Amino acid sequence: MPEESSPRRTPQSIPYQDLPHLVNADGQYLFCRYWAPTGTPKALIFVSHGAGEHSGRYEELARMLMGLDLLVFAHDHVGHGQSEGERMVVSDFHVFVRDVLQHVDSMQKDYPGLPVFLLGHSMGGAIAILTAAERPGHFAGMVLISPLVLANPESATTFKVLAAKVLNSVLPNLSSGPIDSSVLSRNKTEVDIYNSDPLICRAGLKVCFGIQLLNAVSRVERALPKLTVPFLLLQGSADRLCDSKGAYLLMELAKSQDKTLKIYEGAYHVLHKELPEVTNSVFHEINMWVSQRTA
Ligand SMILES: O=C(c1ccco1)N1CCN([C@@H]2CC(=O)N(c3ccc(-c4ccc(F)cc4)cc3)C2)CC1
Numbered sequence: 001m002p003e004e005s006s007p008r009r010t011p012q013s014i015p016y017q018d019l020p021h022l023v024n025a026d027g028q029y030l031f032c033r034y035w036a037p038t039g040t041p042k043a044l045i046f047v048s049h050g051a052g053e054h055s056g057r058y059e060e061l062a063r064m065l066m067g068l069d070l071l072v073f074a075h076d077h078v079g080h081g082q083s084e085g086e087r088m089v090v091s092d093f094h095v096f097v098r099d100v101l102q103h104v105d106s107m108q109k110d111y112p113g114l115p116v117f118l119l120g121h122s123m124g125g126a127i128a129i130l131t132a133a134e135r136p137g138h139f140a141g142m143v144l145i146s147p148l149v150l151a152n153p154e155s156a157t158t159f160k161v162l163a164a165k166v167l168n169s170v171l172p173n174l175s176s177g178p179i180d181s182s183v184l185s186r187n188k189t190e191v192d193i194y195n196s197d198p199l200i201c202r203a204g205l206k207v208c209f210g211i212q213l214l215n216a217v218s219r220v221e222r223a224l225p226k227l228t229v230p231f232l233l234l235q236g237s238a239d240r241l242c243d244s245k246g247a248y249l250l251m252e253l254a255k256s257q258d259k260t261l262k263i264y265e266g267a268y269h270v271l272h273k274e275l276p277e278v279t280n281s282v283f284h285e286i287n288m289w290v291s292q293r294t295a
Pocket residue numbers: 049050051052053057121122123124148151155156157159179181182184185190191192194210213214241242269270273
């Protein structure tokens with residue numbers, strides 16, 4: 001008599017059968033999160049995290065959105081957090097977009113008729129832009145916190161010089177330095193918390209993953225003229241990763257009839273984990289923007 005194989009587990013050894021999950025098109029398990037209101041939801045909102053992090057970093061923002069009677073959902077992208085995959089490896093950037101679409105499609109089946117929004121930060125913001133561009137007219141709105149639109153010219157040059165070797169030769173272990181958290185938030189407590197979270201990937205960016213991030217920038221650039229979804233764009237002027245010029249480029253090139261930009265003077269990259277004055281303002285502005293577009 002044949003027997004079923006040992007239960008499939010997260011990279012942290014927890015059986016997926018004990019957790020909310022989804023199996024993507026490549027047969028990889030993605031860990032899922034849900035924050036649902038007690039009544040009937042007004043809308044659905046997908047939360048898209050960035051490179052090296054995971055959906056658990058959005059707990060407070062998700063609970064604020066749930067308090068507005070929206071059903072919030074998320075997953076850890078492939079190679080991240082509690083999902084499967086070689087850490088910070090992706091065969092092609094589109095895998096991230098494909099997986100977001102599968103989860104959105106799955107959720108719209110269980111809750112039909114509801115409008116669906118996207119919220120993304122950094123690489124997760126590039127994913128949100130590409131997801132909306134793939135389905136024009138389908139999403140009710142998008143909230144972008146420092147999206148990857150234009151990379152910091154210094155970081156782009158470093159990755160274009162490191163790609164030069166990998167694209168022309170076989171160098172599977174080639175990597176750049178790790179994500180420097182101290183220059184991504186002025187809130188030292190938040191930097192310390194990020195540095196203490198075991199689910200964050202602290203290794204240096206592999207050149208093959210940096211190539212997929214440069215692909216994402218190129219794809220976002222082509223997608224901008226086709227974007228029509230309503231969006232709220234939050235950007236810090238002292239962003240060392242996602243150059244503020246990209247936020248201005250997104251306001252200029254998108255065709256969306258409903259687009260708004262809020263610049264946070266002197267703020268660093270991670271606006272939702274910045275100084276309390278900035279983070280409180282970010283939560284308030286997202287609350288107002290989504291409240292005005294839901295009923
Ligand atoms: O919560 C925190 C935190 C709290 C306090 C301090 O930090 N986070 C740290 C930053 N991290 C970002 C997510 C993401 O996509 N990152 C990233 C973006 C572009 C790149 C990029 C690099 C080179 C390039 F050429 C293009 C893009 C690299 C990484 C980072 C979000 C989570």
